[PDB]
Amino acid sequence: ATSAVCVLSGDGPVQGTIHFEASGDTVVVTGSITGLTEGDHGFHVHQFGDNTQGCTSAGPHFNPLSKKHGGPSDDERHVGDLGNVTADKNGVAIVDIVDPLISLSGEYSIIGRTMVVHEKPDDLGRGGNEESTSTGNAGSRLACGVIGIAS
Amino acid sequence: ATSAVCVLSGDGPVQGTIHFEAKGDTVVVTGSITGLTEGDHGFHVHQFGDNTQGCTSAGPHFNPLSKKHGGPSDEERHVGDLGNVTADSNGVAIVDIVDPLISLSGEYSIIGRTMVVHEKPDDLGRGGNEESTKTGNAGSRLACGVIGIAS
Numbered sequence A: 001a002t003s004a005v006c007v008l009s010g011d012g013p014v015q016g017t018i019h020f021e022a023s024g025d026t027v028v029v030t031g032s033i034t035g036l037t038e039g040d041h042g043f044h045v046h047q048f049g050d051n052t053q054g055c056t057s058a059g060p061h062f063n064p065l066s067k068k069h070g071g072p073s074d075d076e077r078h079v080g081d082l083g084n085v086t087a088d089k090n091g092v093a094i095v096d097i098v099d100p101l102i103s104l105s106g107e108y109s110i111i112g113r114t115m116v117v118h119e120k121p122d123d124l125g126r127g128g129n130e131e132s133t134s135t136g137n138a139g140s141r142l143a144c145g146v147i148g149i150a151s
Numbered sequence B: 001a002t003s004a005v006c007v008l009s010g011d012g013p014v015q016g017t018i019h020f021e022a023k024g025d026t027v028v029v030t031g032s033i034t035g036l037t038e039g040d041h042g043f044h045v046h047q048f049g050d051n052t053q054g055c056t057s058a059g060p061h062f063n064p065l066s067k068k069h070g071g072p073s074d075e076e077r078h079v080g081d082l083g084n085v086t087a088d089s090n091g092v093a094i095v096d097i098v099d100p101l102i103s104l105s106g107e108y109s110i111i112g113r114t115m116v117v118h119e120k121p122d123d124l125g126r127g128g129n130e131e132s133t134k135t136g137n138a139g140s141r142l143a144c145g146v147i148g149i150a151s
């Protein structure tokens, strides 16, 4: 696949559409998320594209290299660690990310996995407790969707 | 992947959970769908895993080999053609299908694509009209979901 899309939904007001495109040797992530509280929100690819129990069944962060959680610019990060998205005063977050670890094909493919937007800011693995090294203390999953092949 | 899952949702009361498991050179499809009218309902893999416009944005049947529509046992069929599921008097359809053309990996992978349950029976390409060889005359899309990787 060269293009993918994800519609985020949850039990609250948070909604959004995220587009993925393979450009050259990298992946470009764009889109927008609405209904968020102003501020930073963790934004990650979780391992499973299973929404049988809402976003809970998406599992932990996608992590084929078995590393600890970090920010997108770190060497020590999960493949799914895309950092934070920032919502304005109106609750809108514009997504504009380029990432060197995710892919749309092969071992690092995120097709069929779940994009999640979280309640709190991701501390990028620097919070100092065990939880920071797993999830960045980003908290609950406000909305999520399975990443599918797009035209 | 060797296992996948799909949660079917729509604008009406139809919902369901479908599981997929690679076994030998086949995929075993199991699960249940509820809220259906009694009788047969077309059941297909559509090409795109795009839910931006509900089930409509899923596109046509998955058809990488450019064939006409058929039933699952026909040589001339779409890869996505899984025939019909049957709902009982209480609106419950039990899914139990073994298919050799769909796959969870490689060229015919259905991960990231959409499963759709239709309003009418699939005529399996033997309807006598032109629509029969395209969609089986299965009509409306009652519910759909993107096929994701499962644990």
Ligand SMILES: [Cu+2]
Residues within 6 Å of the ligand: A042, A043, A044, A045, A046, A061, A116, A118, A135, A138
């Ligand atoms: Cu997360």
Ligand SMILES: [Cu+2]
Residues within 6 Å of the ligand: B042, B043, B044, B045, B046, B061, B116, B118, B138
């Ligand atoms: Cu169909």
Ligand SMILES: [Cu+2]
Residues within 6 Å of the ligand: B044, B061, B068, B069, B070, B077, B078, B080, B081, B134, B135
């Ligand atoms: Cu077909």
Ligand SMILES: [Zn+2]
Residues within 6 Å of the ligand: A044, A061, A068, A069, A070, A077, A078, A080, A081, A134, A135, A136
């Ligand atoms: Zn992580």
